[PDB]
Design an enzyme around this catalytic site. Sequence first.
Site, PDB file in Angstrom:
ATOM      1  N   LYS A   1       5.172   7.027   7.229  1.00 52.77           N
ATOM      2  CA  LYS A   1       4.667   6.099   8.245  1.00 52.77           C
ATOM      3  C   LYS A   1       5.808   5.640   9.134  1.00 52.77           C
ATOM      4  O   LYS A   1       6.924   5.433   8.672  1.00 52.77           O
ATOM      5  CB  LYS A   1       4.055   4.839   7.595  1.00 52.77           C
ATOM      6  CG  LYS A   1       2.722   5.004   6.965  1.00 52.77           C
ATOM      7  CD  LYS A   1       2.202   3.602   6.518  1.00 52.77           C
ATOM      8  CE  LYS A   1       0.748   3.437   6.866  1.00 52.77           C
ATOM      9  NZ  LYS A   1      -0.023   4.682   6.606  1.00 52.77           N
TER      10      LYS A   1
ATOM     11  N   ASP B   1      -6.236  -6.722  -1.974  1.00 52.32           N
ATOM     12  CA  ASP B   1      -4.852  -6.991  -2.373  1.00 52.32           C
ATOM     13  C   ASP B   1      -4.752  -8.055  -3.473  1.00 52.32           C
ATOM     14  O   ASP B   1      -3.867  -7.994  -4.314  1.00 52.32           O
ATOM     15  CB  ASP B   1      -4.004  -7.356  -1.152  1.00 52.32           C
ATOM     16  CG  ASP B   1      -3.855  -6.213  -0.193  1.00 52.32           C
ATOM     17  OD1 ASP B   1      -3.996  -5.036  -0.616  1.00 52.32           O
ATOM     18  OD2 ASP B   1      -3.600  -6.384   1.039  1.00 52.32           O
TER      19      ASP B   1
ATOM     20  N   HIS C   1       0.829  -1.211   0.000  1.00 53.23           N
ATOM     21  CA  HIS C   1       0.000   0.000   0.000  1.00 53.23           C
ATOM     22  C   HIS C   1       0.853   1.246   0.000  1.00 53.23           C
ATOM     23  O   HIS C   1       1.928   1.251   0.547  1.00 53.23           O
ATOM     24  CB  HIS C   1      -0.931  -0.021   1.193  1.00 53.23           C
ATOM     25  CG  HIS C   1      -1.871  -1.188   1.190  1.00 53.23           C
ATOM     26  ND1 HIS C   1      -2.562  -1.600   2.307  1.00 53.23           N
ATOM     27  CD2 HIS C   1      -2.217  -2.037   0.193  1.00 53.23           C
ATOM     28  CE1 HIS C   1      -3.286  -2.663   1.990  1.00 53.23           C
ATOM     29  NE2 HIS C   1      -3.091  -2.951   0.718  1.00 53.23           N
TER      30      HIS C   1
ATOM     31  N   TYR D   1       1.049   1.968  14.010  1.00 50.43           N
ATOM     32  CA  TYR D   1       1.534   2.840  12.950  1.00 50.43           C
ATOM     33  C   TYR D   1       1.261   4.271  13.363  1.00 50.43           C
ATOM     34  O   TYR D   1       0.155   4.577  13.821  1.00 50.43           O
ATOM     35  CB  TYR D   1       0.742   2.641  11.612  1.00 50.43           C
ATOM     36  CG  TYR D   1       0.460   1.259  11.098  1.00 50.43           C
ATOM     37  CD1 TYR D   1      -0.447   0.441  11.739  1.00 50.43           C
ATOM     38  CD2 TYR D   1       1.039   0.807   9.922  1.00 50.43           C
ATOM     39  CE1 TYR D   1      -0.768  -0.816  11.248  1.00 50.43           C
ATOM     40  CE2 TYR D   1       0.731  -0.456   9.414  1.00 50.43           C
ATOM     41  CZ  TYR D   1      -0.168  -1.258  10.089  1.00 50.43           C
ATOM     42  OH  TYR D   1      -0.494  -2.526   9.624  1.00 50.43           O
TER      43      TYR D   1
END
Lengths: 199, 199
Positions: free
Chosen positions: B81, B177, B71, B141
Site C-alpha cells: 500500500k 476493529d 489491517h 491509498y
Amino acid sequence: SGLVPRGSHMRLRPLGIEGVWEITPEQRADPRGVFLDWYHVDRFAEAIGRPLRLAQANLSVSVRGVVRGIHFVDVPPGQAKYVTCVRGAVFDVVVDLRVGSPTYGCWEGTRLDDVSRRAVYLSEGIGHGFCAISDEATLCYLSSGTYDPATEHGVHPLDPELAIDWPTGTPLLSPRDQDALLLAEARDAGLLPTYATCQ
Amino acid sequence: SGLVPRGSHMRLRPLGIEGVWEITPEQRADPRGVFLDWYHVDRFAEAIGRPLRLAQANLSVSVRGVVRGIHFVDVPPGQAKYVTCVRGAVFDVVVDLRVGSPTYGCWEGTRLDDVSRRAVYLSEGIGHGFCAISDEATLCYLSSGTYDPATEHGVHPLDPELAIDWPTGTPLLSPRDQDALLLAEARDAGLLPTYATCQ
C-alpha cells in the site's frame, strides 16, 4: 451529520469523445466516515482494454476561479491521465486535440467534486483543463507517463473555436496558459496529435 | 496568503521497519496554488526495487478521533500500500506483523497531512492503521492488490503489546476493529504473516 454522500457501485461509462470515460466510484458512508474505491484494475482493464500504467501521481491545489489548461502530451509517446477531485469542486474539461478525429475541437465538461467523487480517464492525445469552483480545490491525477518538459504542451484555454464555458467571470490564468497558442495556431504549426497515431 | 507549504524535491527514505518507506513529494507553491508529484515510478522502482503495481485506488474520510486498523492482507498473496493524506491530518501507523522479523510487534507513527503531504509505502505483511487528528481527514491509498474479503484481516488497535500512542483520549472504533483479535491471539491461531514468506 454534515452532507452524507450517495452510496454507489462502480461504473465506467464513455463520454462523448472516444477514449474518454467517466468513473463512478464504489462508495459507502457510515457515522465514522466515507469509504470508496475510485480505481479498480479489473473493472478498468475490461472497459478501457488494458490496466492503467502508473508512472506518476500528482496533486494540485487551486484557488477559485483559477483556469488551468488546456494541456496535453505529444503522441508519441502520449500520456493517459486518470483524474479526480479529492477536496472541493472543479469544472473539469477534456478537449479532443486529435486531428482527424470526429470530435476534433470538441470539449466536454464534468463536475469533479468531493461529494460524488467521480473520476475521468482520458487517453493519449486528449487535452485537459479545469476551473476551481470551490474557494480552493484539490485534484489528484494518476498518469501513464512521467513528466517530460519536451513533450508537454498546451493550447489557450480561452481559445475561440473551443469557446469553453468556464464557470467564472474572471479566469485566473498562469503566464504559461495566457501565452499558449490558439488551437488553430497549434494545428497550423503541426503541433497537435493526429487521430490515426493515437488509434 | 493562507499557509504556504514548503517547496521540496522528492525523497524516499526507509523507516525503522524493513519494507516501509517515507516519501517526501516534489512540491512547489505559487499564488494560484500548490503542485506536487507524490509518486514517481523511476524514483520508486529504484528505491524499493520494482514499480508499484496499481490494482486499486481508495479514499477514506474519517472524523476526528476515529482510530481504524490494524489491517493487513494474508501472505500470500500479500498486498502493498502507498498512502497519503490529501486533506486534513492523520497519525498514520505501520505495524510489523511478520513473525520472525527483527521488528515483529513494533510500530511506527508518521504524521500524514495536507501541509507536508508525505506518503508512506508499506510492503506485504505490514499492518496499517491511523487516527484522524483534524476534525475530518481524507486518506488516498494506492494498493498492489484488489480487495478480497477472504484475505483481509486485522488485529486490535488497542493491543497491549503494541500499546500504540493514538493521539486521542476517546478512540472511535468500528465494530470490526473493536472485535479484532489481540496480536498474540492472532499469532497463536497461526493467522499472521511470516517474515520468511514476505521476504
